[PDB]
Amino acid sequence: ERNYEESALFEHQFWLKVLTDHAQFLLDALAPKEKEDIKKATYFVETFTNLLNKVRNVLMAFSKEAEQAAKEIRAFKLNIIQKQLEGKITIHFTPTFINHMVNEVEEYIAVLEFLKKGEVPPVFHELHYHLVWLTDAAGHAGSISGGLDLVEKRLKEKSEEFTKHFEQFYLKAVEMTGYLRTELHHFPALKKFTKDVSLELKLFSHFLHEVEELELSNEVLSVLSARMADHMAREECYYLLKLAQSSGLEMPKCNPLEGHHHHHH
Amino acid sequence: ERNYEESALFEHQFWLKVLTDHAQFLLDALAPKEKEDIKKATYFVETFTNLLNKVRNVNLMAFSKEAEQAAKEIRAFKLNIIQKQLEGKITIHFTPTFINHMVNEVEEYIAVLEFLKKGEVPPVFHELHYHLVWLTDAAGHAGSISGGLDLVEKRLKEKSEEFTKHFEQFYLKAVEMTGYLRTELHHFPALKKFTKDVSLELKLFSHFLHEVEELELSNEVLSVLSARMADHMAREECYYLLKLAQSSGLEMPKCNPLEGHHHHHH
Amino acid sequence: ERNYEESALFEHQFWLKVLTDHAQFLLDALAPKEKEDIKKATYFVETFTNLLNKVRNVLMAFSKEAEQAAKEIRAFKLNIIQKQLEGKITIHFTPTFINHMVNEVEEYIAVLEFLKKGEVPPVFHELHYHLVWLTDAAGHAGSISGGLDLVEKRLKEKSEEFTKHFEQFYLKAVEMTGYLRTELHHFPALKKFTKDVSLELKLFSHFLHEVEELELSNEVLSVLSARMADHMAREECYYLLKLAQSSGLEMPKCNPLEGHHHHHH
Amino acid sequence: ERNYEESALFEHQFWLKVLTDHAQFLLDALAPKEKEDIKKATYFVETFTNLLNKVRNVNLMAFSKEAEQAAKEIRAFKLNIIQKQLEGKITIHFTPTFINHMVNEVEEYIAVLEFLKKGEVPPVFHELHYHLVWLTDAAGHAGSISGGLDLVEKRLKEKSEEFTKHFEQFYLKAVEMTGYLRTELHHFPALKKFTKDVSLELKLFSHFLHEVEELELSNEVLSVLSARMADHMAREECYYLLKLAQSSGLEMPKCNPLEGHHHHHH
Amino acid sequence: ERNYEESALFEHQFWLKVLTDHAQFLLDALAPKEKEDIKKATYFVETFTNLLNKVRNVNLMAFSKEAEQAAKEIRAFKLNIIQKQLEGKITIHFTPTFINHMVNEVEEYIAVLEFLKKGEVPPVFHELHYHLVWLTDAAGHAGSISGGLDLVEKRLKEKSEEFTKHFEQFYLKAVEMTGYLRTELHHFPALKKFTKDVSLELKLFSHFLHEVEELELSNEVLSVLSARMADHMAREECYYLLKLAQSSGLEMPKCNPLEGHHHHHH
Amino acid sequence: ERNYEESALFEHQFWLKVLTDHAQFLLDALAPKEKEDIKKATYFVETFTNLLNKVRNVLMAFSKEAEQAAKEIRAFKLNIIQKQLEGKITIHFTPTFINHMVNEVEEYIAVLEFLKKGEVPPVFHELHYHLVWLTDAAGHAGSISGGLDLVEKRLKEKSEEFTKHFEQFYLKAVEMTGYLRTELHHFPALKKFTKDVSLELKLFSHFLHEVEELELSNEVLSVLSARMADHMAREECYYLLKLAQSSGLEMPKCNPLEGHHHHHH
Ligand SMILES: [Fe+3]
Ligand SMILES: [Fe+3]
Ligand SMILES: [Fe+3]
Ligand SMILES: [Fe+3]
Ligand SMILES: [Fe+3]
Ligand SMILES: [Fe+3]
Ligand SMILES: [Fe+3]
Ligand SMILES: [Fe+3]
Ligand SMILES: [Fe+3]
Ligand SMILES: [Fe+3]
Ligand SMILES: [Fe+3]
Ligand SMILES: [Fe+3]
C-alpha cells in the first residue's frame, strides 16, 4: 500500500540522481570548445546535486522547485538536439540517446504533476511503461555496443543481441497498445509479454553489472564508464519495479536509488 | 491545388475499395463454423461494394455520412474479432496484429471523413504522421507474405523477411524523429532524407508485390496468399507513397492507389 | 516382443486420431464458400471419429474398413492439392503441409497392408522413418513459424531453428540411404545420426508442449491451436518410438495416442 | 529430333570423360599407403581414358556393353571405398557423400546404357527426375569448393556456401513437388517456374565455376582444388542444364558438356 | 620516376595534414575536465597546422628534422593517452584501438622521415608492408563509423559493419601470405590477385566515405561523426591505394591523398 | 620453479611428437604421384620417431641433432608451400595449414636456441603465445570445418564458431601488442583477455576430444582422423600451459605430451 511520503522520497531520489547523471554525462560529452553548453551542463550538475542533497520528508513545495529544474534541463537537452539536427554542436552523444534523456525527464515531470499536488503518483497501465522504457533499454544496449573498442567483439555481439530483443519487444508493445481499442485492457498475452520482458531485463541487469565491473577494473576497452553502467542498471531496475507493480508480478531485488559500488558508505 | 470534388472522390474510392477487400479477406479467413461472423463479413462485403460503386459527384457530403456509419461498424467488427482472438473465442486465419492494422486503416478513413462530411478538403498531414501509420502496415504486409508462402518458397521468404526488417527499422527511426519534433523544428534534413529512403524502399516493395501478384495469377507460387491480396497491398503502398510525395515535397509516384493493372473488367 | 492385438489397437488408435485431426484441420481451413469440400471434410471428421470409437480387440475386418476410409481421405487431400496447383480452391493450408498429410495417410496404409492380413506390422529400417518423418517435423516447425503473429519474434526464431535442424537432418538421411548401396545396412554413423535426431525430437516435443500451453492460456498470438500442437507432439512421439525400436534405443516417455490436456478423463 | 548415332556418341563421351575424371580424382585423393586401391584407380584411369577415345560410330551397341561392364566395376569400387570409410578402413581425401554422388552419377550412365545396348535412343526423363539427381550433386559441388578453399579465402567461401544453400533449398522443393505428382498432374505452373529458377541458378553457378577454374589455372586462389575439378563440375552442370531445357521446354544452354574451354589440346 | 622534391613535398603535406587532423580529433574528443591534455592537443593542432603550411621546396632536409621532432612528440602524447585509458585515468571519446591506429600512422611518417632527413627518396615498400599497416586501419575506420552512427541508422551501420568484416578478413589473409614469404618467393600470383581485390574494396569504401561525408555536410545522417573525419579517412585510403598501385604494379588511383573535394577554401 | 632437465625432456617430447605428426600428415596428404616428396615425408617420419625414442636425461648435444632435423623439415614445408604457390604439387593440405606447421617448427627452434646452450627456455610474454597460437587454433577449427562431410552441418557450425572466435581473439592480440609501445607491459585488459582466451581453449579442447571419439568410433563422416584431433588437443594444451605460466593463471589439467587414447600402455 503506497503512501505520499515514501513514494515522494523514492521518486525524488531516483529521478534527481538520474538527472544529475544526465547533466554529468552531457558535460563530459561536449567538446572543450562548447563553452556555453559546458557552463549550462555544469549548472545542471550543481543544481540536481543540490536538490538531491536537500530532499527530505518535509515536500510539496520541494516538488515545485524540482519541477522547474526538470523543465529547464529538458529545454537544454532539446536545444542540444536542435543544434545536432542543424550541424551546430560537437557532442559525443547521438541525437537519439539525448532523445531518450528527454523521454526520461518527461516521466519525472509526469510524476511531479501528482507530487506537487500532494497526491501519490499512480502506477500506470503496464503498457505505458513498456512504451517508454523498451526503446530506452534498446538505446542502452546500443550505446554499449557503440562505446566498445573495435576489438571487443564478444561483448558487442552480446549487447547487439539485447538491442534487438528490446526493439522486438517495443514493436510487440506498440501492437498490443492497439489491441486496447477492444476495451479489453488486460488479457493473457499482455501479462505473458510483461513477464517475458521482465526476464530479459533481469538478464540485461546482470550484463550491465558485469560491464560495470569490467569498467571498474579497466578490464574492458571502451569509452563507457562504470557510472554509466550503474545509471543504466538503476533505470532498468525502476522499470522492473513499475512492471511488477503494474502487472502483479514478484518485486525485483535491486535498488533503483543506488548501485552496489557507486556510493561512499 | 487539391479541390473538394476530386479529393473526396479519390479518398472514397481508395478507402471503400480497401474496406471491401478487408471484409472479403475476413470472410474468407473465418472457419466455416463461425456462422455469425461469416454473416457479418458478408454483410460487410455487400455494404462496401455497394458504397464503392455508389460514390459520385452527386450529394458527396451526405454520402460521407453513410460511408462514415459503415466504417465505424466494420471497425467495431474488427475490434470484436480481435477481442475474441485474445480470449480464444474464434477461429480465423488472420493473426491479431494483421487485423489490428486493418483497424489502423479504417481509422485513417474515419479521420479523412471528418473533413469530407464538413465539405472540406482533408489536409495533407506532416509526413511523420504517414510514417507512423504506414510503416508498421508495410512490415505487416511483408510479414504476412512471408508467413503465407509454402515451406519450400525459401527464396521468396528470404526476400519478404528482408522487407519486413527494413520497414520495422524505418519505423524505429520514425518513432525517434517524432520525438525530435519536441524541439519545435518540424522539418530538418535528416527527416527529408528519411522520407526519400522510405520512398525508395516502397518502390522496391511495390515491384516485389507486383511480382507476387503475377506469380499468384499464374499459379507459379505455392502459398495461401491470393493475387487480390498482393494487389491490395500494392494499392496501399501507392497511397502511402502518394501522401509522402505531397507532404514531403517529392516527385509524385507512378502508380494508381485505386485500381491495379489486373483486377478490373475493362 | 510385439503382438498382433496390441500392435493393431495401438496403430488404429494412433492413426485414426491423426486422420480425425486432419479432417478437422482441413474443415476449419476451408473458406466458407468451399461448400463441396466442407461437406467432404465434415464427412471425414464423422467417419474417422466413428471408426476410432469402434476400435476393439475383436480387427482384421475392421482394418479393411479403416483402409477404405484412409484411401478416401488420401484422394480428398490430393484433390485439394490438385486444385491448389490450378488456383481452384481457397484453403488456409499450403500445398506442402497437405502433401505431408498425404505422406502420413500413406504410412497408415502401409501398416494396414499387414494388419488386414492379421500380421504384426514390422518395425522398418530406421532410415525409412527418417525419410518420412524428418520433412514432416520440418513442416511442423515451419507451420508454427508461419502461424505466429508478426510480433512473436522470439517464438518464430525458435521454430525457424527447428525447421532448419530437421531439414539438415533430412539431407543427411538422404545421403545415408545412398550409403546403403554398399550393402552395409547398419554402421556407426547411422546409429549416431538416429540418436542425434532423437535428442532434437525430444527438444522439439518440449517446444510443442510449451506452445500448446501458450495456446490453451491465450498467451501466444497466432492462428495455431492447442489441438494442432497436441497433434504435432503425438506424431513426434510415434516417430521417436519407431526410432527407439528400429535402432535399439531407450523408449521415449510420451504417449502417441493422447496428450496431457486434450482428453475428457 | 534425337537420333541414335548422335545421342549414343554424346552420352558416351560425356559419361566416359566424367568417369575418367572420377577415377583420376580418387587416384589422387588416396593416401600413398593405400597401394591396392591406388592400383585399382589407376586401372580405372587407364580403362575410361581408353573407352573415352575408343567410342565412335562403329559397333556402338557392342561398345555399350563394354562401357557398361566398366561402369559397374567402377561403381563397385566406389561403393567399396564408401564401405571402408564407414568402417574406418581407408585413408582417402574425399568425404563419403562426395563419393556417394559419384555413385549417383555412374548409375545415371548405367540407366542410359540400358537403352544404348538395345540400340535405342534413351528418352528424356520428366524434369523432376533430373532435379532429384542433380540438385544434391550441385550442392555437393559447391560444398566441396567451400571445403577445399584455404582458411583465408573467405569471400570465395561465402559465395560457394550461398550456392550450396540454394541448391539444398531447391532440392527440398523438388522433393515436395515430386509428391504433388501423386495428384496425377505431372506438369503444372509451379513446376515449370521451379525449373526456370533452377536453370538461372545453374547459369550463375557455371560462371562461378568458370571463375574458379581460371583462378586455379593462374594459381591466384589458395586451395586444394584443381582447375580440372572445376571444369568437371561445369561440364556436369551443363549436362543438367541441357536435360532440363529438353525435358521442361526451355532454351538450350550455351555450354558444352563434353569439353571445357581450357582442358583440350587443339 | 620519383624525385626528391616532389616525393618530399607530397609526403609532408599528406602526413602533416593527417597529424593536424589527429590532434584536432583528440582535442574535440577530450572531456572538458581534461585541461592538461586539452592544452597539449591544442598545441598539437597549432604545431602541425603551422608545419603543414610551412613546408615548401626551400630547406626541405632541415624541414624534415623539425617535422620529425613534432611527430615524435605527438606519438608520445598518443601513447600517453592510451596508457591512461588502460589505467582508467582519462576521459576521452576515442577507444584505445583507434588511438593505437593513430600511432601506427605517425610511425609510418617517421619511417618516411628517416629517408627525407637524409635527402633521399623514400622507397616504395613491398605491397604486403602496406597491407599489414592499412588493412587494420581501414577496418578501424569502418568500425568507427559503425560505432559513431545513431541507434536508428541501421542501414548505414549494416554497410559499415560489412566493410569492417572484409577489411579484417583481408588482414588475416595478408598475415598468412606474409608467412608464405618465408619461402623466399616474394611475388606470386595469389599475392597480386589479393592486392587487386583489396584495391577494389578500397574503391568501394572510398565511395561510401564520400557518401558519408556528404550526409554529414547536409546534416542528413544522425551521428557523432563529422564530415572532416570522413574526408580524413578517404584521404588515407587514397594514400594506401596509391602505394599499392606503385608497389604492386596497378593503375594509379583517381583520388587526391592531400585534399578532399569539400574541405578547402579556393 | 622450472629446471633444465625437466623443461628439456618436456619440450623435446612435446615437439618431436608434433613434428612426427606433421611428417605423417604430410605423407598421407601427398598424392601417390608425388614420389619425391613422399620419400622426403617418410624420411621425416623415421627421423622424428627415432629422435623421440632416443630422448633421455643425458641433452645439450641431443638438442643440436634435434635442431638440424627441425630446420630440415622446416625447409621441406616451405618447399611444399612454394610449389603450392606455383601450381607444382598435389597435396591435400592448404598453404595456410602448412604455413601454420612452419610457425610451429619455428617455435621449437626458438626453444632449441636455449636448450642447446643448456639454458632453461624462458616463459615469453603472454602476447607472444597469443600471436602464435591464436591463428593456429583458428586454422585448427577451420580444418575441422573443411574436413567434415557436407552433411555434418551441426558439427560444421560448431567449428565455424570456434574459427571465428579465435580469429577475433587474434585481432585483439594484434592491437594489444600495439598498446605495449606505451611501455606498460601488463595491464588489466590484457590479463582478462588471456583469461577469456583460456576459457575458449578449454571449450575447444572439449570439442576436439568429442571429435576424436567420433572419429575413433566412425560416428562422424569426414576426412579427418582421430590422430589429427589428438594432435590439435595436445597443441591447445601446450598453449594453455604457456598462458597459465606466462600470465599467472591456474595450470590446465591436460597433457601436451600424450592424449587419453593414442598410446600403447
Ligand atoms: Fe538515463
Ligand atoms: Fe536511459
Ligand atoms: Fe489493408
Ligand atoms: Fe494494409
Ligand atoms: Fe498430421
Ligand atoms: Fe505431421
Ligand atoms: Fe562427377
Ligand atoms: Fe558431380
Ligand atoms: Fe588517421
Ligand atoms: Fe586512419
Ligand atoms: Fe601441429
Ligand atoms: Fe597446429
CA B234, CA A236: separation in Å to the nearest integer?
41
Could you give the 3-state DSSP secondary structure of residue D149? strand
Residue written as cell 553457378? D205
Residue A228 CB coordination number (10 Å)? 23
CA A120, CA A245: separation in Å to the nearest integer?
14
E168 CA to centre of ligand 12 in angstroms: 22
Q: Do chain F and chain C touch with ≥3 beta carbon pairs under 8 Å?
A: yes
CA D137, CA D100: separation in Å to the nearest integer?
9
CA C239, CA C132: separation in Å to the nearest integer?
9
**DSSP letter string over B193-223?**
HHHHHHHHHHHHHHHHHHHHHHHHHTT-S-B
Whether A153 sits inside 8 A of F172 (CB atoms) is yes
CA B206, CA A239: separation in Å to the nearest integer?
40
C109 CA to centre of ligand 5 in angstroms: 14
A24 CA to centre of ligand 2 in angstroms: 14
Nearest CA in chain D to E197: D155
Instruction: Outline where chain E has alpha helix (H).
Output: 4-29, 35-54, 60-86, 96-116, 127-148, 154-180, 189-217, 227-248
Q: Say whether residue B251 is in contact with chain D using an 8 A CB cutoff.
A: no
For E221, which of B166, B172, B190 is closest by C-beta distance? B190
Minimal CA–CA distance to F83: which of F98, F103, F68, F101? F98
**What residues of chain F lie within 8 A of the CB of C171, using their CB?**
151, 153
E256: left (phi over 0), alpha (psi -120 to 50) or beta: beta
- Inter-residue long-range contacts of B158-167, CB under 8 Å, 24+ positions, other chains counted: B159/B208, B160/B208, B163/B138, B163/B139, B163/B201, B163/B204, B163/B205, B163/B208, B164/B139, B164/C150, B166/B201, B166/E155, B167/B135, B167/B136, B167/B138, B167/B139, B167/B142, B167/B201, B167/B205
B101 CA to centre of ligand 4 in angstroms: 6
Q: Say whether residue F179 is in contact with chain A using an 8 A CB cutoff.
A: no
Q: Which grid cell is A215?
A: 569498467
Q: How far is C63 from chain F (nearest CA, A)?
A: 40
Q: Are D29 and D148 in contact (CB under 8 A)?
A: no
Q: Do chain D and chain B touch with ≥3 beta carbon pairs under 8 Å?
A: yes
CA D206, CA D203: separation in Å to the nearest integer?
5
Q: Are B215 and B221 in contact (CB under 8 A)?
A: yes
Q: What Å distances lie between residue E202 and B229, E11, E17, E97, E199, CA to CA?
A: 44, 20, 21, 21, 5
CA dihedral C235, C239, C242, C243 (to 10 degrees): -160
Task: Please give the resolution of this entry in Å, rounded to 1 decimal.
Answer: 2.1
Nearest CA in chain D to E180: D222
Minimal CA–CA distance to C132: which of C181, C91, C99, C161? C99
CA E91, CA A38: separation in Å to the nearest integer?
15
CA B220, CA C85: separation in Å to the nearest integer?
8
**What residues of chain F lie within 8 A of the CB of C165, using their CB?**
154
CA B101, CA B258: separation in Å to the nearest integer?
19
A223: left (phi over 0), alpha (psi -120 to 50) or beta: alpha
CA F228, CA F21: separation in Å to the nearest integer?
8
C132 CA to centre of ligand 6 in angstroms: 10
Q: How far is C141 from chain B (nearest CA, A)?
A: 10
Chains with at least 3 CB pairs less than 8 angstroms from chain F? A, C, D, E
Q: Say whether residue C187 is in contact with chain F using an 8 A CB cutoff.
A: yes
**DSSP letter string over B28-50?**
HHB-TT-HHHHHHHHHHHHHHHH
Q: Say whether residue D114 is in contact with chain B using an 8 A CB cutoff.
A: no
Q: Do chain D and chain A touch with ≥3 beta carbon pairs under 8 Å?
A: no
Q: Say whether residue C138 is in contact with chain A using an 8 A CB cutoff.
A: no
Whether F82 sits inside 8 A of E185 (CB atoms) is yes
Taken in order of first residue, the domains within chain A and their CATH numbers are: 1-265 (1.20.1260.120)
Q: How was this structure determined?
A: X-ray
Q: Which of E183, E187, E194 to mutate to probe the F interface, most F CBs <10 Å?
A: E183
A209 CA to centre of ligand 2 in angstroms: 15
Interface B-D: count of C-beta contacts within 8 A: 27
Residues 6+ apart with CB under 8 A from F84: D222, F91, F94, F95, F98
C215 CA to centre of ligand 1 in angstroms: 38
Q: How far is D83 from chain C (nearest CA, A)?
A: 6
H-helix or E-strand containing C73?
A: helix C60-85
- Inter-residue long-range contacts of D43-49, CB under 8 Å, 24+ positions, other chains counted: D44/D19, D44/D73, D44/D74, D44/D77, D45/D20, D47/D23, D47/D74, D48/D16, D48/D17, D48/D19, D48/D20, D48/D23, D48/D74, D49/D20
Instruction: Round the CA-based radius of gyration of chain A to a whole number and report it.
Output: 18
Residues 6+ apart with CB under 8 A from D262: D213, D214, D217, D227, D231
A213 CA to centre of ligand 6 in angstroms: 50
Chain centroid to Cα E170, Å, comes to 17
Whether E171 sits inside 8 A of F167 (CB atoms) is no
**DSSP letter string over A54-83?**
H-----HHHHHHHHHHHHHHHHHHHHHHHH
- HEC profile of chain F: CCCHHHHHHHHHHHHHHHHHHHHHHHHHHECCCCHHHHHHHHHHHHHHHHHHHHCCCCCHHHHHHHHHHHHHHHHHHHHHHHHHHCCCCCECCCHHHHHHHHHHHHHHHHHHHHHCCCCCCCCCCHHHHHHHHHHHHHHHHHHHHHHECCCCHHHHHHHHHHHHHHHHHHHHHHHHHHHHHHCCCCCHHHHHHHHHHHHHHHHHHHHHHHHHHHHHHCCCCECCCHHHHHHHHHHHHHHHHHHHHHHCCCCCCCCCCCCCCCCCC
Q: Say whether residue B189 is in contact with chain E using an 8 A CB cutoff.
A: yes
CA A197, CA A180: separation in Å to the nearest integer?
19
Whether A189 sits inside 8 A of B86 (CB atoms) is yes
Residue ranges of D 217-246 with Cβ closer than 8 A to chain F: 219, 222-224, 226
Q: Which of C71, C82, C103, C179 to mutate to probe the D interface, most D CBs <10 Å?
A: C179
